Amino acid sequence: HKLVPLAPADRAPAVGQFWHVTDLHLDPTYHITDDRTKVCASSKGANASNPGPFGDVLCDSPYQLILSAFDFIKNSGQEASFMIWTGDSPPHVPVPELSTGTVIKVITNMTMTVQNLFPNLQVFPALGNHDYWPQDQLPIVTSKVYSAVADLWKPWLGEEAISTLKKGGFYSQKVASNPGLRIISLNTNLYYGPNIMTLNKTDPANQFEWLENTLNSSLWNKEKVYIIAHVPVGYLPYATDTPAIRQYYNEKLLDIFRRYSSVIAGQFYGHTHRDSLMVLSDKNGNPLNSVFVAPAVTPVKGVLQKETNNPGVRLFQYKPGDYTLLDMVQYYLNLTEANLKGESNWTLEYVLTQAYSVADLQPKSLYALVQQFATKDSKQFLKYYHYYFVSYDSSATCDQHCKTLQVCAIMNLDSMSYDDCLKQHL
Numbered sequence: 075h076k077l078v079p080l081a082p083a084d085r086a087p088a089v090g091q092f093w094h095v096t097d098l099h100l101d102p103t104y105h106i107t108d109d110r111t112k113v114c115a116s117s118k119g120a121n122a123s124n125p126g127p128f129g130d131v132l133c134d135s136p137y138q139l140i141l142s143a144f145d146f147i148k149n150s151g152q153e154a155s156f157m158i159w160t161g162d163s164p165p166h167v168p169v170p171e172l173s174t175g176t177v178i179k180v181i182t183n184m185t186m187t188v189q190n191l192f193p194n195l196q197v198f199p200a201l202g203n204h205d206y207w208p209q210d211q212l213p214i215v216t217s218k219v220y221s222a223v224a225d226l227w228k229p230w231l232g233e234e235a236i237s238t239l240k241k242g243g244f245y246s247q248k249v250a251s252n253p254g255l256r257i258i259s260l261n262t263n264l265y266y267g268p269n270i271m272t273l274n275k276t277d278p279a280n281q282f283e284w285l286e287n288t289l290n291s292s293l294w295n296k297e298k299v300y301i302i303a304h305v306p307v308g309y310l311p312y313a314t315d316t317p318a319i320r321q322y323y324n325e326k327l328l329d330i331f332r333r334y335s336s337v338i339a340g341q342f343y344g345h346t347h348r349d350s351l352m353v354l355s356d357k358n359g360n361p362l363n364s365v366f367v368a369p370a371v372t373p374v375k376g377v378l379q380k381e382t383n384n385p386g387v388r389l390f391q392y393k394p395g396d397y398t399l400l401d402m403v404q405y406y407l408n409l410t411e412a413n414l415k416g417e418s419n420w421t422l423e424y425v426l427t428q429a430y431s432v433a434d435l436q437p438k439s440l441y442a443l444v445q446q447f448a449t450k451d452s453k454q455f456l457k458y459y460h461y462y463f464v465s466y467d468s469s470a471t472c473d474q475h476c477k478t479l480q481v482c483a484i485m486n487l488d489s490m491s492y493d494d495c496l497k498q499h500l
């Protein structure tokens with residue numbers, strides 16, 4: 075007779091789950107036509123290779139492809155308490171074929187697609203480098219795009235997040251359904267090489283100072299943080315000695331992350347359109363923080379590229395009220411199969427713990443996995459390289475130089491450790 079909360083059962087608490095989708099790159103021009111140079115503006119005059127209703131490898135995403143991905147999520151049977159969405163909604167077309175109003179129109183379409191299909195789902199977006207006109211020129215003060223997305227994303231974000239988003243394209247937000255968890259959505263496009271607006275700025279839009287203060291508050295309030303952004307930290311795995319953002323910013327951002335590794339329970343990025351792992355470590359090789367780069371929904375590649383990705387979306391599992399990452403489930407669309415019969419079959423690609431025989435996604439568990447990759451003829455690395463392209467090409471091979479570049483980028487996010495890895499393994 076005293077109104078005490080009702081105790082749950084002795085059952086095991088169910089894991090928490092969240093979706094990650096990225097790099098949708100809608101091409102509204104997509105349409106099948108005899109002259110394959112007119113199928114999609116994003117092929118920039120090249121002949122689409124073998125186009126179908128769900129797209130083509132030389133094209134960005136038809137609306138039907140993006141719809142099939144979100145329909146899959148909706149009907150998947152997976153419970154999820156939120157979704158992260160790390161940017162890049164307009165297609166790859168020349169700057170004069172876009173405008174601020176066109177960019178805002180595509181972002182609106184994608185946002186409203188999500189809000190219409192998932193009316194009760196909190197979504198945490200980040201801006202990508204194509205989410206601005208002209209592309210990559212994301213500014214260090216308020217702008218029409220920043221104001222537009224602050225209005226579009228208001229259903230998901232509190233007043234403070236809306237205020238920082240409008241001013242600089244970044245925010246942090248407590249997760250309604252997960253007390254003790256905070257999402258930090260960075261604008262890492264401010265650090266991206268092509269951005270003229272941030273040349274020679276030590277702290278563009280004051281995001282480093284803001285990030286430092288946010289993480290410090292999280293540390294003292296005993297919160298855990300998931301970092302999300304479009305462009306990742308670290309090195310490109312397919313090129314030699316090339317940081318994904320400007321070296322000065324990569325070093326500075328990584329030092330913040332190392333200092334707050336006890337608070338940061340995950341980092342999630344897009345932009346590369348590939349499935350990649352990174353493990354942030356200290357100078358002595360001790361693992362500190364796990365990093366997950368998710369592949370894109372668009373399958374687009376340039377004519378000069380041999381390989382591309384299949385469309386992908388992914389799901390993370392985490393410990394409730396604790397937020398340690400337990401697993402990752404990668405789903406994909408076999409685009410050639412879907413196009414041939416005209417019906418999509420989004421399906422499981424792999425479960426990380428099962429594919430690699432690891433216990434969970436903690437930095438030490440993944441560090442031990444990537445150490446296996448480094449062994450000669452590692453079957454684990456061969457599997458990883460197949461998944462890097464989301465199973466696009468089972469016959470794709472990675473020679474000695476290719477593999478050194480991959481493994482060095484997985485394990486060494488800062489310049490000193492990366493260059494030392496090259497010294498040892500080139």
Ligand SMILES: *[C@@H]1O[C@H](CO)[C@@H](O[C@@H]2O[C@H](CO)[C@@H](O[C@@H]3O[C@H](CO[C@H]4O[C@H](CO)[C@@H](O)[C@H](O)[C@@H]4O)[C@@H](O)[C@H](O[C@H]4O[C@H](CO)[C@@H](O)[C@H](O)[C@@H]4O)[C@@H]3O)[C@H](O)[C@H]2NC(C)=O)[C@H](O)[C@H]1NC(C)=O
Pocket residue numbers: 408409410411465466
């Ligand atoms: C996504 O869905 C696609 C479409 O179904 C799958 O791609 C098909 O995969 C099958 C099997 O891997 C392919 O069938 C085999 O093709 C081999 C030829 O390899 C390539 O080279 C020729 C060049 O002429 C291309 O035309 C061809 O499309 C391939 O890209 C043949 O060697 C095989 O024949 C022999 O082996 C098999 C046993 O393995 C026997 O069944 C045969 O009778 C014969 O003895 C076989 O024909 C098929 O070609 C692929 N189609 C396309 C369009 O690429 C993907 O595998 C799937 N993705 C995933 C991850 O599952």
Ligand SMILES: *[C@@H]1O[C@H](CO[C@@H]2O[C@@H](C)[C@@H](O)[C@@H](O)[C@@H]2O)[C@@H](O[C@@H]2O[C@H](CO)[C@@H](O)[C@H](O)[C@H]2NC(C)=O)[C@H](O)[C@H]1NC(C)=O
Pocket residue numbers: 110111119120121
């Ligand atoms: C885009 O493709 C057209 C058509 O390509 C042809 O059709 C393919 C299915 C295949 O049979 C190719 O070998 C063909 O080229 C290209 O125009 C045709 O190209 C060849 C050589 O010029 C010739 O057979 C046709 O007369 C050409 N013109 C037409 C109208 O068919 C065109 O060059 C391609 N464009 C680009 C940028 O690659």
Ligand SMILES: *[C@@H]1O[C@H](CO[C@@H]2O[C@@H](C)[C@@H](O)[C@@H](O)[C@@H]2O)[C@@H](O[C@@H]2O[C@H](CO)[C@@H](O)[C@H](O)[C@H]2NC(C)=O)[C@H](O)[C@H]1NC(C)=O
Pocket residue numbers: 286287290291294
């Ligand atoms: C990180 O925060 C600590 C803790 O300070 C408190 O943390 C939050 C609740 C926030 O709301 C702050 O206002 C609080 O004061 C800071 O530690 C303080 O450091 C100064 C020296 O600069 C010292 O005089 C205070 O006594 C310290 N307070 C405590 C409680 O130890 C620290 O400065 C913050 N770090 C950064 C980089 O800003």
Ligand SMILES: *[C@@H]1O[C@H](CO)[C@@H](O[C@@H]2O[C@H](CO)[C@@H](O)[C@H](O)[C@H]2NC(C)=O)[C@H](O)[C@H]1NC(C)=O
Pocket residue numbers: 102137138182183186187
């Ligand atoms: C997002 O864009 C898609 C594609 O442009 C819209 O679906 C199309 O809507 C127009 C009508 O305005 C038709 O011309 C197309 O045939 C529709 N389908 C496709 C596959 O193109 C969709 O309505 C837009 N959604 C929102 C919320 O704006």
Ligand SMILES: Nc1ncnc2c1ncn2[C@@H]1O[C@H](COP(=O)(O)CP(=O)(O)O)[C@@H](O)[C@H]1O
Pocket residue numbers: 097162166203204312344345346347376379
């Ligand atoms: N996987 C890759 N292999 C080779 N070149 C790439 C690869 N990814 C990107 N590039 C190159 O890096 C630059 C950025 O490419 P984008 O397609 O815009 C990535 P996004 O669409 O996420 O912004 C391009 O010049 C592109 O040619």
Ligand SMILES: [Zn+2]
Pocket residue numbers: 097099162202345346347370
């Ligand atoms: Zn992209």
Ligand SMILES: [Zn+2]
Pocket residue numbers: 162202203204304345346
């Ligand atoms: Zn990008």
